[PDB]
């Protein structure tokens, strides 16, 4: 849900600084949204990316399964027997 990209070999490098996957540049201290469900910030010589989707935790992974919904960029857990009903979760990570 979060990874660090150092200015020691970033993917699709173009400005050696911090260029988004779209092909647009951005000034330091600026944030941009890419992949239409991912975010990241640019620093002098460092980049920190984090997704917008939350992770389910503290729930019965045996009786409930997490479902990925792009339309809402989030993870939801429902009962296996009845996917209509949601599953209780202690907390979410984001």
- The residue whose two tokens read 């201290």 is 29
For residue 68, the cross-strand partners are 75
Q: Which domains are assigned to the chain?
A: 1-52 (2.10.70.10), 53-94 (2.20.25.590)
Per-residue b or e along 57-68, where b marks 16 or more CB atoms closer than 10 Å to that residue's CB? eebeeeebbbee
Half-sphere exposure of residue 6: CA atoms within 13 angstroms, side-chain side: 1
Closest CA to 17 of 40, 43, 37: 43
**Distance between CA 71 and CA 43 in Å, rounded?**
30
Residue 66: CB partners within 8 Å, gap ≥ 6?
56, 75, 76, 77
**Distance between CA 68 and CA 12 in Å, rounded?**
27
| 78 touches 66 (CB < 8 A) | no
Technique of determination? NMR
Residue 14: CB partners within 8 Å, gap ≥ 6?
23
């Amino acid at each position: 849900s979060c990874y660090f990209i150092p200015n020691e070999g970033v993917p699709g490098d173009s400005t050696r600084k911090c260029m988004d996957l779209k092909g647009n540049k951005h000034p330091i201290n600026s944030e941009w949204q890419t992949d239409n469900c991912e975010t990241c910030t640019c620093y002098e010589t460092e980049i920190s990316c984090c997704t917008l989707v939350s992770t389910p935790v503290g729930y019965d992974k045996d009786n409930c399964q997490r479902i990925f919904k792009k339309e809402d960029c989030k993870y939801i857990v429902v009962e296996k027997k009845d996917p209509k009903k949601t599953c209780s979760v202690s907390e979410w990570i984001i």
